[PDB]
């Protein structure tokens, strides 16, 4: 078949869009007349000398902005800002219309956006710089739709989603072929958790432009993850990596996470689990040979090293991530959770409970941190406190599928005795969730259910005891057999009772 | 081990929030959208020559609904004769 790569959509496009759009050499006419100069961006192009030459020759603003874009690709954000400023100082822009000055103001706006993005810090200062540049551009030329796109992006960064959505509605009124408007709308919808609504926009943008940056396939894979079709997500991410093999390590990280999830939830045997887990570790390490300080990779490796009893290195990585990415609360929550898990072996119940609470406060979506908090409450013999916390969490999250939480609730209520009905409900929910997940149902839940049903239904209790015995197999104990025999004796099953007693 | 099983169930669900770095959109990222002032319009009109057919078959497979039938005509107004 036809190879799926960047060259595929290169050949799909006409040769005008193939070579010219990716030229690394810029042709600049000279002020002397027909003389021109060609400077290759592969070589080390100096910003100051190039700007001085451009000002002397008074070249078209397109060349200035193209050089700025290339220096952006080089990462020279300061150099691109210098290019923009000296272009504003150039005679061409001063003698041109206000439209060119507005376009360069919007370019400086994009420069501020990239400076904020590349650092994820000083957000207010760069946002103010970008806002001032965008306001100047709009005042100089308000008819440019790029000013509206910049306004919408500014609203999105300040979480003014309604105004950005209105701006994208206006852009859709102007034209429905605007790819950037589609991307911004889909980003806002994903931020608003409208995964499917953003997914239609992702598909439309991908169909319109398969070579558009940012990659729509990243959002499509996120939606497939939200729609459980993670296999298609991985396939689309592989296609994106083929199209974008550079500066897209996040796709490889997502692929590694998907492989780890598949290994956890699909390995049919221990040997297959080991093979898949080691392959995922090798792929993660190969990605780490490019970047060795990525906080998410360290957090992921912390799980493996905690499972390897390397708690000291887990603490080192957690502290390093906390120092680097304290802005991200999710990393703080994960580090606190791992510190509490490490201290659990040390049984620092007060310290582990405090760490679990801090993890919950950092990121409330971390259910595991709350479950560890409840477990630590149990460790400190806080039966009532753990019960109250668990009831609060369940009543706030009645739709959450925390099977172990429901099992613990059932056990606590069985110990209480008076709340047997909630215990039955929670144990049945745990049984159903385990059956849906194809996970081994704990026979202890069956024993608790039989104990509860002793005073309600001997038939259901006996059936649950039989199910627990079938799960145990050779693990049947003396108490289970004695209770089965007593059940059959009460059922007048003399033969079965005698066999169970034997 | 109960918390380990809970982690395995959860895996890295809530850790994908930071991975949204691909959602950010910047104009300068595209190489050829800026080389001319109207390169945006040219590239928006460069893909009008392309369609779903020109998409790669594997990328077409990525277009999954979240075939024509012979008995559903498209309406007309002048007919023929």
């Amino acid at each position: 078949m036809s190879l799926l790569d960047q060259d595929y959509y290169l050949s799909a496009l006409p040769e005008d869009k193939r070579a010219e759009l990716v030229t690394l050499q810029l042709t600049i006419p000279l002020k002397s007349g027909d003389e021109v100069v060609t400077i290759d961006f592969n070589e080390d192009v100096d910003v100051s000398q190039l700007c001085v030459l451009l000002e002397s020759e008074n070249a078209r603003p397109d060349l200035w902005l193209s050089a700025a874009k290339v220096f952006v690709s080089k990462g020279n954000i300061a150099g691109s800002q210098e290019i923009i400023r000296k272009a504003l100082q150039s005679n061409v822009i001063l003698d041109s219309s206000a439209s060119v000055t507005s376009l360069f103001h919007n370019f400086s706006f994009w420069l501020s956006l990239m400076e904020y993005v590349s650092t994820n810090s000083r957000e207010d200062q760069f946002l103010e710089y970008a806002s001032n540049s965008l306001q100047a551009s709009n005042s100089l030329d308000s008819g440019l739709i790029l000013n509206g796109i910049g306004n919408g992006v500014l609203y999105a960064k300040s979480r003014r989603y309604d105004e950005a959505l209105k701006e994208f509605d206006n852009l859709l009124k102007k034209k429905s072929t605007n790819i950037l408007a589609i991307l911004g709308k889909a980003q806002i919808l994903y931020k608003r958790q409208k995964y499917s609504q953003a997914l239609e926009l992702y598909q439309k943008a991908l169909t319109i432009n398969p070579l558009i940056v940012p990659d729509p396939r990243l959002g499509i894979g996120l939606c497939f993850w939200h729609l459980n079709n993670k296999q298609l997500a991985e396939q689309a991410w592989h296609n994106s990596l083929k199209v974008h093999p550079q500066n897209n390590l996040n796709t490889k990280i997502l692929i590694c996470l998907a492989k780890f999830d598949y290994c956890f939830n699909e390995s049919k045997d221990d040997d297959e689990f080991t093979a898949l887990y080691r392959e995922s570790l090798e792929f993660l390490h190969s990605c780490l040979k490019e970047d060795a300080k990525h906080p998410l990779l360290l957090m992921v490796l912390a799980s493996y090293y905690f499972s390897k009893e390397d708690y000291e290195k887990v603490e080192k990585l957690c502290n390093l991530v906390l120092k680097e990415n304290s802005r991200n609360a999710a990393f703080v929550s994960a580090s606190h959770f791992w510190l509490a898990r490490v201290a659990y072996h040390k049984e620092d119940y007060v310290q582990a409970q405090k760490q679990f609470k801090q993890a919950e406060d950092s990121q409330n979506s971390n259910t595991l941190a709350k479950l560890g908090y409840a477990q630590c409450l149990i460790a400190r013999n806080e039966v009532g406190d753990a019960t109250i916390y668990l009831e609060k969490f369940f009543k706030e999250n009645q739709d959450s599928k925390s099977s172990e939480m429901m099992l613990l609730l059932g056990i606590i209520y069985s110990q209480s005795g008076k709340s047997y009905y909630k215990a039955i409900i929670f144990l049945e929910k745990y049984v159903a969730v385990c059956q849906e997940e194809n996970y081994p149902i704990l026979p202890e839940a069956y024993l608790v259910l039989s104990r509860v049903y002793e005073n309600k239904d001997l038939n259901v209790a006996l059936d649950y005891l039989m199910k627990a015995n079938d799960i145990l197999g050779d693990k049947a104990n003396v108490y289970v057999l004695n209770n089965l025999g007593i059940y059959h004796f009460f059922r007048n099953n003399v033969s079965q009772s005698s066999d169970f007693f034997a | 081990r109960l918390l380990s099983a809970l982690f395995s169930k959860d895996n890295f669900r809530y850790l994908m929030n930071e991975t949204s770095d691909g959602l950010d959109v910047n104009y300068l990222r595209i190489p050829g959208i800026i080389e001319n002032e109207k390169s945006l319009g040219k590239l928006f009109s460069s893909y009008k020559n392309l369609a779903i057919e020109n998409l790669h078959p594997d990328d077409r497979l990525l277009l999954v609904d979240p075939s024509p039938v012979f008995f559903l005509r498209r309406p007309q107004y002048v007919s023929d004769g």
Binding site: D269, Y277, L281, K316, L317, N438 | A5
Partner: peptide, 30 residues
């Protein structure tokens, strides 16, 4: 039988021991 075959140590809770049985050397900075 794949429904019963998949039930093994990691599902039973011996996942940590399995990871301990998998040894790998990283180029750790810390």
């Amino acid at each position: 039988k794949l429904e019963s075959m998949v039930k093994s140590n990691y599902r039973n809770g011996g996942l940590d021991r399995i990871i301990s049985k998998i040894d790998f050397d990283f180029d750790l900075e810390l």
